[PDB]
Ligand binder design. Structure first.
Ligand SMILES: [Mg+2]
Ligand SMILES: [Mg+2]
Ligand SMILES: [Mg+2]
Ligand SMILES: [Mg+2]
Ligand SMILES: [Mg+2]
Ligand SMILES: [Mg+2]
Lengths: 336, 336, 336, 336
């Protein structure tokens, strides 16, 4: 059967989920029947047609009354800050893609359930009470039909976990620390202005700006064997999109650059195909823009010194994650 | 006979006013006795000490109880959204520098007067009910002792008016059109996201972005002879500070590049000294960063074809305006 | 029936000509049989596959011996700084697209003729002795079979001429001055370093940088009725591609914003279709990236104040010009 | 008793050495008596007066005949491609600061000695035949009076060595891998164009760009106990100046964040004072611009998991190195 989906929060994440669905030729048996956003529907349609990072949408978008029509599909448009008031039950909603950032716990995301939706996928790290945290390609097999509110982790965790899973299986990971060299986001600023975080209060276009991230530590939610073994932080730099996971870890046994690369090449050609890619060309970050993979491992950067191993992976922090939201939607509704 | 001033709204404008006052070695007979802002005082002190565009403040800033100490001066720190409740009368406030953007009409800014302040200067274009709109160096002579709420115009108007006045006096301006090539501001965005204006919704770091400007029409408030004679627009480009007025106008008689430049050089050396500067060096925009002048005419860029004249002037859209706020404060208190 | 073309200089202009030829489905009866460049063929093939400004080439590129194979077409790769030594006669070359910038006079470009080529098109303004200067869509009808070395003008002139010709025909242009807000190019620098021009010696990523340009003054070569009537200069700003022509001119009779826009709308739908486009949407510069038109008139920016008229047009300064090089190749070989 | 120095190559490195000498109040007993450069002396003086990254020189620069006058000091200006022909002996030159990049071996740099100079310091990694490689503050004690050609290492090595030496002494470094997040340089490009390295051929303003660095292996030249223990690479990102060393290493034993930070705090307060700094404030990269230290350790970024340690240090990749060139000059002439 066809999964009826709605997108709560038509910001960048929600817009890129919708665009990912149409730009892969709706390969998932999914129908987006509604979007909720406080912005003017004409403005959101315009930002769907044109994007700086991801170019022009290769389709048609029009506004007709209470609907945005995308390639002939009429999508109901809503504007209500309180999700519990949305008519999910009347629309027969199967899955709410919760992309606002304000409803990341199971209790808060349950407002969608109160409105009549069957399930919720949070496009972000969830509270400790969520039923599951999923990196598709790594641990979607843990999903069950009884799960009603899950987290899709973060963009960074979806890049790191496919990288570390095969390495732990074949080599063993004692402990690891990560730096993600990360594009700036809209939580940052153009010129210095008041901000809850004194570093993010500084111009993102002119500086490297450290900031905390739990993505490395969150790999333990997806790979329990690595609980407490990984940590790290991020350095925001002046690029608009595409980021880099830089993981240094102590292997449990002696290895080489070639063996490390061979493990990830086999994973990219096998169990993790189309989720993890294997790259040997001399590419730069923009070459991975609009790439739907979760983790684009760069074998040219691999370094080994003793037991310390350094592996790096490019990821489009918007496009890979938005595509994974669709994969996880299908897996959740297929769970028994 | 020292003017006791307070800053309402310690954003970038309010911070740059305070920094301008202390960096020129408190050259005005002004004492900043209080700041009102809803933000954490420690955060605002940090952003006073460090700025990307304007560098490190060459002084000391500390927070001690209810005061921010700048070079040893205790400045009361307040946080009250209703100006009528502020203790301006108890603090003997002469002038409120209104820098929040929420009290730009005389009706709204009068709340400061109810609180005990004598006068208010709005750091932006004012409503139609303001007693005056002032570009210092051009029309501060219109101020009278009875004026209680005035506008300091905008940064763009403070660059255009000193540029066009001497040319109008000696040549005559029949009509004119201008483009303001302008640095991005915090009203813009890092990557495409909802905005009231569909063009400002687009990444400011990657595109030239057209936007409206009222400077051309607002010059008529400061120079009534030019009412309705000027029009134009602005283009935001990926620079953090410093902007450019590019004015094309039809003169009332034929002229030459040499005469046009000579007129502005005389004004820069005379009546408009320290407000309008005359530049002949091969400079670029960043060379005018942290320049306190309102209008830096670039004689190297002048073009003339018969009556058609093209003149260009660089201006630090933050620092020039901030210094002019201090000049206008003294002029208002000296008005008879 | 097929025009045999070679590209001398496989820098950005030459590469974008080749990419334009293949991305339009090779719609012109043109075969690129050789490219000459001093760079390594593997390097030039890599830069054909991947570009920052224009994305990934939607085709295949490989290196096989002395050939670069593009979508199965074997293209001879040469590396000789002296074009007169190139085997144009042996390869039956009809037209050399001269894109190095070193052979812009008819005498110098004649080196290709000595090598056996029939004709040369310079991808830049030519010396005074070139047989013609062409803005395709405007004056390609002046080409004759006897012309052997021509200029395709510049990207800026190809944007300006389609904009100003309809206006001169219907309104009349007395005189005009223009600014081109222009993306930086590889003649500029990342951080201050020695340069023949002291303004271009300054970081292009941080400043607006004035620079000379002859595009407006040279328009008389393409539209002799406007000889001597136009001039201007450029402001380089921190964008990687796409620029804006900003023309202010005195019309010979009274007009209005609506009449000015109507003139250009008729031209865009008629004589100048697909060369000049007519835009009314609230777009920004990146929206015109990879747009093959010569001149994208922005009707939303038009201003009129008395007899002074301001019209503006976006242009992809690389892609429009590269596509026009192909159009002019066909027109030159079709000339009677 | 005053060391007479000349600068061979007045590019950015030579300019910043001169500016460092004058902007610290000539704190070294050094007089710059000549500079050799093939560029126009007026252009080089202009770029000394104005810089985008480092602002305006706080002094006087004029050109008078064959001399450039800096704060009243007449500096002979020479232009000779053959250093053996330079009048170093006639000028009594003690130390040649070799900053051209063309004389990085002792064999090549000896041409200055043939010209009459006593010693040469290469402002870059040297060939295997150089008498020493110096990171000032770490191993300048290895210098001997008999040394005639030495290397000052690189900016990255001058940041890494002060960071890792105290950690090795007190904690022990078994092995380490580093990433240096590095500002772009003038070896990179604004938009994709030919380069000997296929990654530096890509726009430096739009991408994170991996590149090789010898700093990790070159630390073994200054700290022989660490020979072969460190490896890594660099990521160029879109900032104009200031870079970051991000070192992950396996310690010889389990440790904690507090112990790691304490070791570096003691070093910054002791033997490595003014070379290594200790920072606890929430700063970003631009806050370290124009900072003369070799290594600005950021205690806020430290991470520890068992034996695995991650430490980060900011460094002005231009200004720190330029000041170290002066320190190493004095040490070389004081060596016994
Ligand atoms: Mg079950
Ligand atoms: Mg009261
Ligand atoms: Mg055909
Ligand atoms: Mg031949
Ligand atoms: Mg004929
Ligand atoms: Mg000699």
């Amino acid at each position: 059967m066809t999964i009826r989906v709605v997108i709560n929060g038509y910001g960048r994440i929600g817009r890129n989920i919708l665009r990912a669905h149409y730009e892969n030729g709706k390969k998932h048996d999914i129908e987006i029947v509604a979007i909720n956003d406080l912005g003017d529907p004409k403005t959101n349609a315009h930002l769907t047609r044109f994007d700086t990072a991801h170019g022009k949408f290769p389709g048609t978008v029009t506004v007709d009354g209470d609907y945005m029509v995308v390639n002939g599909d009429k999508i109901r448009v809503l504007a209500n800050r309180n999700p519990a008031e949305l008519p999910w039950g009347e629309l027969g909603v199967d899955v709410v893609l919760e992309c606002t950032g304000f409803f990341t716990s199971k209790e808060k995301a349950g407002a969608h359930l109160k409105g009549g939706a069957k399930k919720v996928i949070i496009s972000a790290p969830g509270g400790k009470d969520v039923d599951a945290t999923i990196v598709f390609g790594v641990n979607q097999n843990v999903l069950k039909a009884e799960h009603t509110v899950i987290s899709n982790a973060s963009c960074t965790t979806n890049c790191l976990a496919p990288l570390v899973k095969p390495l732990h299986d074949k080599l063993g990971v004692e402990t690891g620390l990560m730096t993600t060299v990360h594009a700036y986001t809209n939580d940052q600023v153009l010129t210095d202005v008041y901000h809850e975080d004194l570093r993010r209060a500084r111009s993102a276009t002119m500086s490297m700006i450290p900031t905390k991230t739990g993505a490395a530590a969150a790999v333990g939610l997806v790979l329990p064997e690595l609980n407490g073994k990984l940590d790290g932080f991020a350095i925001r730099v002046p690029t608009i999109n595409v980021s880099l996971v830089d993981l240094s870890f102590v292997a449990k046994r002696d290895t080489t650059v070639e063996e490390v690369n061979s493990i990830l090449q086999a994973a990219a050609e096998g169990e993790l195909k189309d989720i993890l890619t294997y790259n040997t060309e001399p590419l730069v970050s923009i070459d991975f823009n609009h790439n739907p993979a979760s983790s684009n491992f760069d074998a040219t950067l691999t370094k080994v010194s003793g037991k310390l191993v350094k592996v790096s992976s490019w990821y489009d922090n918007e496009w890979g994650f938005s595509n994974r939201m669709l994969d996880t939607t299908v897996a959740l509704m297929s769970a028994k």
